[PDB]
Design a protein around this ligand. Structure first.
Ligand SMILES: Cc1ccc2c(NS(=O)(=O)c3ccccc3Cl)cccc2c1Oc1ncccc1-c1ccnc(N[C@H]2CCCNC2)n1
Ligand SMILES: Cc1ccc2c(NS(=O)(=O)c3ccccc3Cl)cccc2c1Oc1ncccc1-c1ccnc(N[C@H]2CCCNC2)n1
Lengths: 400, 398
């Protein structure tokens, strides 16, 4: 327990176990090329399997958010794979880190996870075992930035060219509590495909922003709840703007019907990942698009459907008194709510002093003024203006 | 000759020479981990130097556009460094490739080169030897996409913490023809710094977009011309929008006075790299910023200075007649107001007018930039007055 194993360019002390894999697989902290590495040791029974994994990584385009091996070695008794030593798994990050001052970092790790996934899917690889345990969080670089990396390719499937799904077998479907329902359900009439990864990631999304919860309950009940379709996201409050949008995305990602789940590239286009500037730009593009638009036309009809709850009966009554004074719009209309936001954005410099003060700076404070008071505004408008998905001017906002 | 050298995980046939470095250095094609690699072989007198180069890269953050070593090996007689086998140097790219169908790819290679350089600078590294020959172009990935990678760190300098320049010595300044004037000039009263790389890079930009020319002339006259400040960019035509924009950036990058050259991060914000869509959004934001501005005010006065040449004396007389159907023609500001207005009311204005303009945003902005090739460049420079306002953050590097 004080020895150092040396195999080619990889060395480690066996006492420094970082974790355990399946079939007698152990991961150690060791060293390579004067760097810290994690080293997976492989038993003879798994040599061919480990080789196939390495080869899949060897052949595939690299991506910053997909783990990359540093070195492989082999002696008489074992094979070894070294990867970069990371700070934490996503599980440990969620369990241990105070989110209070991390700002958007946890969200960027989900965005980075979705990019790694989109990369895999674009290579016709389905992961099938996405979970917080095997999403790895790097050490900070020179400017304090960290990144998420997908690992653990032991269950992945590279689909043949021209193949878009895989059929169910008796064997290993994933990790209990993270397995999409079409892997286990009884009356499933469609092959599993890339979207099993989106279900898992949906669960991962909620796990991160709820800091430890899971849409399908505590671990002992999860997989059973998944088959029943019994999910709950009550860590997301219906009157908080950021929560309404996260819920909007996560509900689609974990949909029981795989065909209703967005693809990874779709997910990446969602308002969840929008800056405040882009949120405001969306509101302005929408408002520009829907003026001259008829009042009984399908678009503004879609927008005003259930809009009373969105504007809170009368949005004229739910803004500060400076803006109230400086405003003849229709208070039960979301279109006119949007019209008023664009108008005041446009003439922002002409606004009286007390008004620019109550609104805040452009764009961040300005848009927060409205999203914080009307928490359903973005999500409602995002879904309503999906009628214009195809239109070129709405390309930045939806995935075509 | 027909043998294979095997050193640890690296192997190669010595017949497969890809090139020669300095001091007996040779680069071969070979193999590593079942991949194609380029293998540099280093002689004993360069062991320590090569070790320092590798160490610099081992410690420094990686970046998609800075070369990464795959492997290092060492026997009794040599040391070896393997990197990824690339398709070409930027020199070979420019010399061999037909640009006619490459679209924006060559510009994209410049942008990735600048991102590599920005990354190096943010790690307080000065490269000091940027040139087409050591900018490498990757093989295509699965989607046919390629990238540029900066290599050759033999002259680089990592400046100590809280140090921003390096002083001149009698020794190696770089590669003749790509050496910034302040490395060799007579009455230079300021230390060289990061911007020696911006000077080289500016020469590289022109080399790519001119497909083989150099701002300071043919190979034998270049460095002498750099000393004189005698440069020419006449592959770039004064009445072509794209050429005007490239000229605006490149002239700054190769400025004799280093303090007038943009940092790599400034470079990356320049309209040279802007999509047609972003060019339009710029014209709209500019229009919005100045709509209430005073005519005598320092902002629109800046914009109207030299304005007549930009709008061709009268811009109303230089557009198509279906647009002339529906301002002050000697004013840049009114040209921009007209553009913003027509974009804003694009849906509700007649069909034949929408036809001559073209679809939004690409064809619409090109209607005006093709007819007023100095409009963007002029406006970008003038509106640098608002470059620290949050609203113009997308357009200028703060
Ligand atoms: C999860 C995972 C999955 C697959 C791995 C794997 N297999 S693979 O499918 O990803 C693969 C990758 C490349 C080539 C082949 C293969 Cl099979 C190989 C190696 C490691 C793998 C791996 O890594 C680990 N597995 C178990 C425990 C720990 C780590 C680990 C890795 C890096 N850093 C850290 N840091 C510690 C520091 C203390 C605090 N906690 C974090 N821990
Ligand atoms: C330029 C350069 C600079 C520095 C190198 C270098 N040193 S370094 O300073 O970049 C460095 C990098 C990492 C670690 C240490 C060091 Cl010293 C090491 C290895 C190669 C280096 C290198 O590479 C070469 N040098 C000379 C000739 C050819 C290549 C080369 C490299 C990859 N692909 C191809 N493809 C051919 C295929 C046919 C068509 N033409 C392109 N050619």
């Amino acid at each position: 327990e004080t020895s150092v194993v040396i195999v080619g360019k990889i060395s480690f002390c066996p006492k420094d176990v970082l974790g355990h894999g399946a079939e007698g697989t152990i991961v150690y902290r060791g060293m390579f090329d004067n760097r810290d590495v994690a080293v997976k040791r492989i038993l003879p029974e798994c040599f061919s399997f480990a080789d196939r994994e390495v080869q899949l990584l060897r052949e595939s385009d690299e991506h910053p958010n997909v783990i990359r091996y540093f070195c492989t070695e082999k002696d008489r008794q074992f094979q070894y794979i070294a990867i970069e030593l990371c700070a934490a798994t996503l599980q440990e990050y969620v369990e241990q880190k105070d989110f209070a001052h991390l700002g958007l970092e946890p969200i960027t790790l989900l965005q980075q996870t979705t990019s790694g996934l989109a990369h895999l899917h674009s290579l016709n690889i389905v992961h099938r075992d996405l979970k917080p345990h095997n999403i790895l969080i790097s050490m900070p670089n020179a400017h304090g930035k960290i990144k998420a990396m997908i690992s653990d390719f032991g269950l992945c499937k590279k689909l043949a060219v021209g193949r878009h799904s895989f059929s169910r077998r008796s064997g290993v479907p994933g990790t209990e509590g993270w397995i999409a329902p079409e892997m286990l359900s009884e009356d499933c009439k469609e092959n599993p495909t890339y979207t099993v990864d989106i279900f898992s990631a949906g669960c991962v999304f909620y796990y991160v922003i709820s800091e430890g919860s899971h849409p399908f309950g505590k671990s002992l009940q999860r997989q059973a709840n998944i088959l029943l379709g019994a999910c709950s996201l009550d860590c997301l409050h219906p009157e908080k703007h950021e929560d309404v949008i996260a819920r909007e995305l996560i509900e689609k990602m974990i949909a029981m019907d795989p065909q209703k789940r967005p693809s990874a590239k779709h997910v990446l286009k969602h308002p969840f990942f929008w800056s405040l500037e882009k949120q405001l730009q969306f509101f302005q593009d929408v408002s520009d698009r829907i003026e001259k638009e008829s009042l009984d036309g399908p678009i503004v009809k879609q927008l005003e459907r259930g809009g009373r709850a969105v504007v809170k009966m009368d949005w004229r009554e739910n803004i500060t008194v400076p803006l109230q004074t400086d405003l003849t719009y229709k208070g039960g209309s979301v279109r006119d709510l949007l019209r008023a936001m664009r108008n005041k954005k446009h003439h922002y410099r002409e606004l009286p002093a007390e008004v620019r003060e109550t609104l805040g700076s452009l764009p961040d404070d300005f848009v927060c003024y409205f999203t914080s008071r009307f928490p359903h505004l973005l999500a409602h408008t995002y879904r309503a203006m999906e009628l214009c998905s195809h239109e070129r001017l709405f390309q930045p906002y939806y995935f075509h």
